Every structure is written in C-alpha cells, then in structure tokens.
Design a protein around this ligand. Structure first.
Ligand SMILES: Nc1ncnc2c1ncn2[C@@H]1O[C@H](COP(=O)(O)OP(=O)(O)OP(=O)(O)O)[C@@H](O)[C@H]1O
Ligand SMILES: Nc1ncnc2c1ncn2[C@@H]1O[C@H](COP(=O)(O)OP(=O)(O)O)[C@@H](O)[C@H]1O
Ligand SMILES: Nc1ncnc2c1ncn2[C@@H]1O[C@H](COP(=O)(O)OP(=O)(O)O)[C@@H](O)[C@H]1O
Ligand SMILES: [Mg+2]
Lengths: 547, 487, 158
C-alpha cells in the first residue's frame, strides 16, 4: 500500500527485513476482521518514523553566529557552546549526540532559544513537557496491539519532526514527579539520556530499537538540586543567569517592543515606547529577575494602544512616556527602597537566591520587651526559616554573644535580652545558610544601638569560630543587591573568584569586600565604636532597674 | 467576519451588564483583529469564580463576530485517541467531539469553549490539552483524513478556571488570563432583574406581567440566601420561586397578579438562612474586625484578645492562641505580641500591662481554617486595645501585614476585602499604602461610604484609632490593679 | 397517546405509596404544573437525591401511575463499553436490536418512562449516558438496527 515511502526511507537491514515480513504477512490477511485494522494501525505508527531521513548539517560559522545573535542579546554561553558544536561538526564528517541543559530563573529566555538554536543548526524543533509526569507509560510506551495503547512520547516527537537528528527540548527536569505506582519517569529519562544507550533505546511499542545518537536533547530547568544525581551525571549544564537594568532595557527595545508591536499588528513609525518609559516601568513597577513581567506589561500597553488607535481610524501617532505612563497600567506598585531608606539598629539587609532568581531579604532583631525588663534571656525566631536557617540563627546567637563578651567585656546586653528575630515577607518560605553572617551583624547591631549603613548588603555562611565559608551563587545575589539600591556588597573571600568572572556591568556600581573572618565585616561596619562608646551602652538601663 | 466596535459593544452590553472590564478586553481583542486581514485564532482564557457567567460570553463573542458557538467538555475525556480521530473502516469506532465538530462547522474560523481547566487509565488528558492549547504545536495536525490540508489556527479556544493554583506553570506561561471578579449587591440585583427573572419566568411557563418581585424582596433574597459572588444560587432560588408560583397559579386555575413584598417575604419557602450583620454594634476592648480572602470571596473575621482572668489576681504572663490559625498566622500573632509589647513601652512607659498579663487570642468561628499574614495589624491592634481598655470604633475594618519594626506591607487582594468590609457595615477601611494602586483599580461603586486610610507605619493606624489616649491617662489605666498585686 | 393533566389524581396516587414523603410529592406537583403550562413536558429529567433505602426505586412506578404511562426498568450496569453494545451492522450475520428496540416494542406508547437502576453503583459508560440523555443529541440518535429515526428527547427518564 505505502511501500514507496519504505523504499525511499533507506532502511537499515534488520528493520527493513522486519517491515518486509510484516507487509508480506499483511498482504494475505483478510480486511474484514478488526485485527486487520489493528495491524494497519500498527503499520501507521511504525512507518511514520523516518529511519533514514536526516537533514543536512550547517557548516557556516558566520551564518550560525548571525542567526544566533539576531534572536537574543546577552546570553553568550549558549552561543559559544553552539559555535563549538558547529566547529566540531565541520571539522569532521558529522558530529551529533551531546545533550545540554539550561538552568536559570524564569524570564531569562532558555525556552525561547530552542527555536533559535534549531534555526542556527538548520534542524527541526520539538518541545517536550515533563512537568506533570508521574509514570513511564508515555515515555517508553505500552504493548503493541492494545486497543487503548499510546506509544511513548519520544517516538511521537520523532514522528512530529519527521526527520532524524532533530532538536528535542525537554521543558522541565526539576519538576518531575517522585513516582509511586504505574511508573517512575526518572528511570526512563535515565535510559533515554544515556549517551551510549541511545543506539538501543528499545521502545515498548516498537520492539525494534531506534537510534537516538543523532538526536539533540536540549534541556530546561530552574533548580539544579531537585534533579537526581544519576540524571545530572550524564547531562552537561549551563547556568543562564539574570539581566542587568541596562541589559534589560537593551533586550526590551531590541526585541520585546517590536514583538508586541507585530503581535497587535500595528504599522511601523506610528506607536513607539520611549526609553524613559521602559526604564521607569521596569525600575518602579516590577521586581522579577527576568523580562517576563516586562513582556506582559508591554503587550498589555500595546493592546491598549491598538484599541485607542482603531477607535479613531490631536495626533495620529501615539507616544508612551513618563507623563502618560499612569494611564495605561495605572499607579505604581513597588518601590526600589521598599522597606525604608534608613535602617534602625538591629535591621540588616541581605541577599538570597530562590527559584524565581535573586532577591533581597531583611533581617530584623528587636527587643520583645521594654528598654530592659526581660528578667530572662530568651531567643525567639519567626518567619518560614526552615531547619538550615534556624540552625544558622542559633549559630549566630552564640557567635554574637561570644563576640561581644570578647571585644566589649562589660557590655552585658545578652545577659538579660529577650530578642525576637524576623525576616519580612513572612509568607515566603526561606532556607539556606547564606544569611549566617547577616544575622550575626543583626544582633551585634541590636546590641550596639547602631545602624549598618543602609546602602550595604551582605551575604555568607558563618561558623562558630567566625570563619566565613563559600555560598552557592553570587551573580544573582549581586544583581539583586544592585537592583535594590545597595552600593557596598559583602561576600565571602571564597567567592572572590566568582566575583572576578562577573560581567563588567554587574560589578559596576558595587563596592566589593571579600571577608575571610568576621573581624573584617565588623571593622568595615562598626568603625566609630571606640571600645568605650559601644561599651557600657546600656549602663543606665542596667543600673537603674536591672541592678 | 467583520470587526465593528460599536455594534459589538452594543451586543455585549445587551448580553451582559456588569462586565465593564471584560467588555473592554474583548473590545481590545476586536480592535487588534481589525487592523489585520485575519484573526490568527489567538487563545483567550477566562479565570474567575463559577457563577459569574464565563460560559455565557461564548455566545456573545460568537454572535459579535457573527459565528457559530461550539461547546466541549474536558472532564469526560482521558485519552488522546478520541481527539486525533477514528477511520471509518472500523465497525466499532464512533466519532468524537473533534471529528463531529470538524464535520459540522462547515465554515472556517470556528469557536470552541472549554468547560474547565481545573477539571483534569491508559491516558493522560493533561498532555492532550497541552497539545491542543500549544500555539507552536497547534499548526502541525496534518491529518490524512482530508485530502486538502487544513489549519488548526482557526480555533479560538476559551478556557475556564476558578483558582490559578490548579493550572500548571507550563500551561500558564503560554496562556493569557483574563480575570473576572464578583458583582456587588447593586450589580447582582440589576443582573438578576434583567436576565435571570425573565429567563426563569419563561422557563417555568409563565408569561411576564403575572408574578413580580419587589426591590426589597429580591435584595433580601440575594442577601440572606446568596453569599457567593456568582449567580448560580440566585438563579436556582428564582427558578424555585417561579416553579412554586406556577404550582400556585395552577391550584388557583385563574388575583392572577401576586406581588412578592418584604412584609410577607418568602414565608412559604422559609426564613432567612444566612445572616452576618447582627453580631453586635458596640465592640468591646480587645476585639477588632479584619478582612480575609477565600475562594468563596471576602469575609470579615473578628480578632478577640482577652484576659484569662482579671489582672489584679493573675501572674506568670502567658500568650495563648486558638482557632485554626496555621503556621503563618501563628507567626504573625507572635510578631504582634512582640510589637505591642515594645510599642506600649515606647509610647506609655508607666503602663505595665504586659508585665503581668496572660493574654488569650481567638478568631470567632473557630471551625473555619485561616491563614495568611493579612491580619498582622489586626492582631496588634487588639492587644493594645486590650491593654489601653479602649474600643476601636466598631464601624472600621482593618487589614495589612506587620513587621517587627512596625511597617505595614502589601497584602494579597483588596477588592474582595473591601466588598466584605462594605457588606459588614464598616464605614472605614484601613489598608497598606503599597496597596493604594489596587484601591485605584476598584469600581467607583465600591468606594462610596468607605474612607480610605493608607498607612506605611503603625503610627498612622494608632493615630487614626487611638485619638483620645494622651500620655497622662494612657500610661495610668490599671494603676489600682497594680496597687493590689504589688503588696 | 394523550398526557394526563389532573394534579389531584397524581397527588392521590402518590399519597398511598409512602407515608410522609412530602417534599418529593410537592416537587413532582410543580413539575406537573410546569408541564401543564407548556405544550409538552420537556426541559428537565426528574432525578432524586437521597440516602439508599428511603424508597427511590418504587418512585418510578409511582410516577408512571401518576402520569398514566407504561413503566419500563432499564439496567445500565450491564453495559461493558460504548461501542460493541450500541448495535451491529444490518449486512452482518451478527445483527441484534438495541435495548431501545425492545423497550419501545414493550411500551407501544409515546413517551415511555425509563428508570436507570444504578449509576453511582457501576471506555466508560458516561459517554453513552451523555449521548442517550442529552436532548441536543436525542433528536437524531439513529440506532444501528433502527432504520427509522427515533426522537428520544420526547422520551422521559427517571
Ligand atoms: N536576550 C534576550 N533576547 C531576546 N528575547 C529575550 C531575551 N531574554 C529573554 N527574552 C524573551 O523573554 C521571554 C521570556 O523567555 P522564556 O519564557 O522563554 O524563558 P524562561 O522564563 O526562562 O522559561 P520558562 O517559562 O520555560 O521557565 C521570551 O519571549 C524571550 O524571547
Ligand atoms: N449577565 C448575565 N446575563 C445572563 N446570564 C448570566 C449573566 N451572568 C451570569 N449568568 C448565568 O450564570 C451562569 C454561570 O455559569 P458559569 O459559572 O460560567 O459556568 P462554569 O462554572 O461551568 O464556568 C451562566 O450559565 C449564565 O447563564
Ligand atoms: N415508608 C417506607 N418504610 C419502609 N421502607 C420503605 C418505605 N418506602 C420505601 N421503602 C423501601 O425502600 C426500598 C428501596 O429504597 P432505595 O434504596 O431508595 O432503592 P434501591 O434499593 O433500588 O436503591 C424498597 O425496597 C422499599 O421496601
Ligand atoms: Mg525554567
């Protein structure tokens, strides 16, 4: 019936023999039975895979570069990786197989670059979602001639591409279900992504195994820690980070504005957004580390502009700027210095990195009591701290007590201080030891009645001896510090190399300070303390009542 | 077909009444499609509580574009085989919704309404609706059933959802959500009198000008019997009343015109069942109102801080919490404890209330689960109210998140909170200044009768509420209470 | 061939069957009144909600007596799939009439009453139930063994 495609597809020997046996067995089969329908459905599912149809690789380095940079602006690591792949493929007859994953917060653009890479490599694209996955039924497939059986999604993807060596982009790997009964997709993904096992995939629906060696498995994920170690072992990862304010403005003006303009179908040279409007929107209306909220705001504004311009068929051109910004989106939402421009004693700024990217959290230590009544020294902490951060809080408790009792002998604050520790935004879960120093500076500040120069943000892990250890992720923290108005950033010395690899735009406007021990932080912040001014601070509060 | 803004606006205004914002969004869509030679079948999704009518906009937009309306239920499909189609060679195969729709459209650019997105063996409907609703993969159907190639970009999928949590993120990021909110009392009364009363009257086989509902009667009906923002319960009640009226007129076999007033208000179908605005006018010290948001809508929870015993014969200051507070609300309660304890010392040094007081904190209706930091300032006001022995002007509502330093932070949802405050008889609402933007997006009908108070720090709230508490009487309130236990 | 419109006789018929079930009697009274105000009883299919054992199976026969139409009891739980049981080709040796065929030949009366035995005690038969109960599809059901069109929308179920 459809032997022409079989002849033209250039099948390997064994699979061709299998298909010829199947067709010559079906030739003598009577069409009346439903078994004929089942077997022809199997042949439809079988002949769909292009066993020998593959596209032609692209050899032009400048063409690949010009395709890549026309679609995205600042993500350079992926471009370099693609250029290395292109050069390696050109240097040999044909190279394929490597699997790459992208890790970053939402809005970076790791999903959008899939099509750009597919066009740059002159190959087709497919998108694969594993977010709601909880079983292996849709990965490896089922038995052949079940009435309700559906084959695996990988062979379906191959059919949709209808050409070998495609580009299959897995949407999520960190959102894979744990897996109870009916299947555990992690093992199926392990089998699929093994570089050497790809030659013998051995799908359940088709007993003949398909060659996945030429297939390019691109990957997208948010958090690296959720992925199990077996999966991460066989896959290479590239960290796609956030964008600076100037980089966000460049990305917006270059790509987001024309994309929203053409989505609403507005003629050029009629409606445009000025630079001040975009920078004001991003700075005073949004806080996310990507450009997604900016994109939705731009699309909504351009839809409103389209509605305005259609209804008229003083000016035929619409200009969007500061003076008419609060007519398209409304009053502003957030504020850069959102808590307070100044800082009372006991409050310390700090940085954090969550699934949504970099952010700034404050740490507030207060006396849950009058000036000094207490009659019992107690330490209380609230907020969604988590186990690691609660342990960091206790360690900071002990370290601050020892540090005062060493540096300032007769400062007896912790003898009868009932301290309450809170991290604002109490509905947002927090974790990680990166605030270990941040809390240590808080209590000390609360115990010295001194501010911490609100233009200063700090991070790092603290130990009982005062040593400051490495932290997992600095560039996002630095971007968050720059966004929130901090000019001085305190990071552990171990991250100094991580500070050197930062782009010149991230480092600009931020004053580095690599602290090995906590003494460096104390000297940087508590300067005017003369060992007698910061000593006997609560002399009146102890003599009059506490005796 | 053709995109004419005025006639579409008139059609939408005739079909629905209080959907000003949704009508504006639909007009935006029509204007966007006008400048293009063909609408590219962009997918529009509606998110709102059931009962607001989001299944009715389908007909209005279909006839505004002069197109047929199609309906599709996802809650009954689990397998993808019923979507891709079945060949006619099979004896047992039956046409699915996709095949039947493709047969009976008979015209390009159809419109299909999805029953629900919150309603998800040998089949995963999530993947099926993913490939249906994926704009990039939508164009790759290429079925061999039709010799001529066909394009799936002609379908304007319309979604339906109550809570955005159920929608997965991979679906959410490629889907545009249009939010539909509830209707205030007046809006729901107009919607009823204009669409539900005539439709239910005709359904019960009753021509108009036979039985009528007075304004007071219908308002009492939608107040004491209807609480949720939708009109499902209102429609059911109207249908039941008109069925009873039809039975009565059959029994009479006929005067004919009977009026439903408030003096004899629905005594044949029972008395009021839901009532909230009769608790108590005068609010005692330590009790304060606050607003909460749930999927049902807005509500008014009280917060009562009391002494377990009179202060003159109590010791060992303890803090107790009841109600289904949860972790975040308990942490907010502890924060309010600390903030009030520090605030009295800062303002009234000689008031030693918290030194020897055992406080008990409750939220009435202790069976309903609660959560969220939106009551952070609500609790902190109670303790001071209990400490200063001062009432809190019972005609005020309060919400906001509090920190240790004493700042009010942004809260998650002010429209339903404002509606609940208005429904509860409050004439003043205290909300964070960061939420002022939301206060400027509320319909103008909500804002009358409520005096806004945007506060950054708690000092604003304290000055607004505690005006007649000077530093001479504020720090000397118990006094004689501490003249007994200190000897 | 004609419907009964006398409410009092239906009330008296329902009275002797059960002692103090007044809400269901009243509801069927408004149902009959609504049908009286219209040309034909259509728009809703009567369905009862309650714990088992209160007698929601003799109600079908009671309503049949009140409406004075023949009663037929149909078991949906005997269905396995939505494809194999919904009829057979006429040209095949395996032709077999559907359940509607024997229901109609037993009733021999327009608008016969059909009672579903168990739905909450049973691909999936939900699709078949939707196809046979939704009035939008009952106008042109066209059973495989029934060449003549059958309008199931006029047919009332319990
Ligand atoms: N450098 C850039 N140049 C052009 N467009 C960009 C750039 N960075 C981001 N974008 C755009 O911003 C939007 C957000 O990207 P996208 O949603 O693909 O990424 P993501 O949020 O990391 O992914 P996901 O939603 O799958 O987790 C896209 O429209 C993308 O094209
Ligand atoms: N303005 C209105 N005019 C007419 N009918 C309305 C209006 N608002 C709501 N309704 C009715 O309320 C019902 C709400 O149903 P809906 O909640 O959309 O269903 P679902 O929960 O499946 O989304 C609709 O059937 C509609 O008939
Ligand atoms: N007034 C009554 N007193 C006692 N039993 C009754 C009464 N009315 C009905 N029943 C019983 O209820 C039984 C059926 O109840 P129900 O559970 O609703 O139906 P089914 O058993 O078919 O689900 C009948 O067998 C009948 O004997
Ligand atoms: Mg991601």
């Amino acid at each position: 019936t459809y032997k022409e495609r079989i002849k033209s597809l250039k099948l390997p020997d064994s699979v061709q023999k299998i298909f010829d046996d199947e067709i010559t067995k079906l030739s003598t089969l009577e069409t009346s039975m439903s078994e004929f329908g089942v077997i022809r459905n199997y042949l439809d599912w079988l002949t769909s895979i292009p066993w020998g149809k593959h596209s032609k690789e692209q050899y032009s380095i400048p063409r690949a570069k010009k395709i890549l940079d026309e679609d995205h602006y600042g993500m350079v690591d992926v471009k370099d990786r693609i250029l290395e792949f292109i050069a390696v493929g050109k240097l040999l007859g044909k190279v394929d197989g490597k699997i790459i994953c992208f890790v970053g917060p939402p809005g970076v653009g790791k999903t959008s670059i899939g099509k750009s890479i597919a066009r740059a490599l002159n190959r087709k694209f497919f998108r694969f979602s594993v977010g709601g996955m909880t079983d292996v039924a849709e990965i490896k497939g089922h038995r052949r001639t079940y009435i309700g059986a559906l084959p695996g999604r990988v062979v379906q993807a191959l059919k949709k591409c209808q050409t070998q060596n495609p580009l299959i982009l897995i949407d999520e790997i960190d959102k894979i279900g744990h897996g109870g009964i009916h299947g555990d997709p992690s093992a199926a993904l392990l089998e699929v992504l093994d570089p050497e096992q790809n030659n013998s995939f051995l799908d359940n629906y088709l007993d003949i195994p398909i060659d996945l060696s030429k297939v390019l498995f691109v990957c997208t994920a948010n958090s690296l820690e959720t992925i199990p170690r077996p999966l991460l072992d066989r896959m290479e990862v590239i960290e796609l980070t956030g964008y600076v304010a100037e980089d966000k403005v460049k990305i917006a003006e270059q790509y987001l504005v024309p994309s929203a303009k053409k989505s609403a179908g507005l003629e050029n040279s009629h409606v445009d957004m000025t630079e001040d409007a975009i920078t004001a929107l991003m700075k005073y209306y949004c806080r996310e580390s990507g450009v997604r909220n900016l994109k939705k705001h731009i699309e909504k504004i351009y839809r409103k502009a389209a509605l305005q311009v259609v209804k008229k068929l003083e000016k035929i051109n619409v200009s969007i700027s500061q003076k008419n910004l609060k007519d398209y989106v409304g009053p502003p939402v957030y504020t850069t210095d959102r808590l307070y421009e100044t800082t009372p004693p006991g409050v310390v700024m700090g940085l954090a990195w969550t699934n949504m990217g970099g952010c700034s959290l404050y740490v507030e230590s207060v006396l849950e009591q009058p000036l000094h009544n207490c009659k019992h020294p107690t330490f209380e902490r609230t907020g969604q701290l988590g186990d690691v951060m609660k342990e960091s809080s206790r360690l900071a408790y002990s370290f601050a007590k020892m540090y005062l009792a060493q540096k300032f002998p007769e400062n007896r604050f912790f003898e009868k201080a009932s301290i309450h520790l809170h991290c604002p935004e109490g509905a947002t879960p927090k974790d990680g030891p990166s605030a270990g120093v941040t809390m240590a500076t808080s209590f000390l500040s609360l115990a010295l009645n001194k501010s911490i120069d609100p233009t200063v943000a700090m991070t790092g892990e603290l130990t009982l001896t005062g040593k400051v250890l490495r932290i997992g992720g600095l560039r996002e923290k630095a971007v968050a510090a720059k966004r929130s108005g901090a000019k001085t950033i305190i990071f552990p010395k171990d991250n100094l190399n991580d500070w050197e690899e930062l782009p010149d735009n991230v480092k600009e406007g931020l004053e580095p300070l690599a602290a090995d021990w906590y003494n460096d932080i104390f000297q940087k912040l508590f300067k005017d303390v003369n060992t007698k001014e910061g000593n006997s601070v609560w002399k009146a509060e102890f003599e009059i009542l506490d005796a």
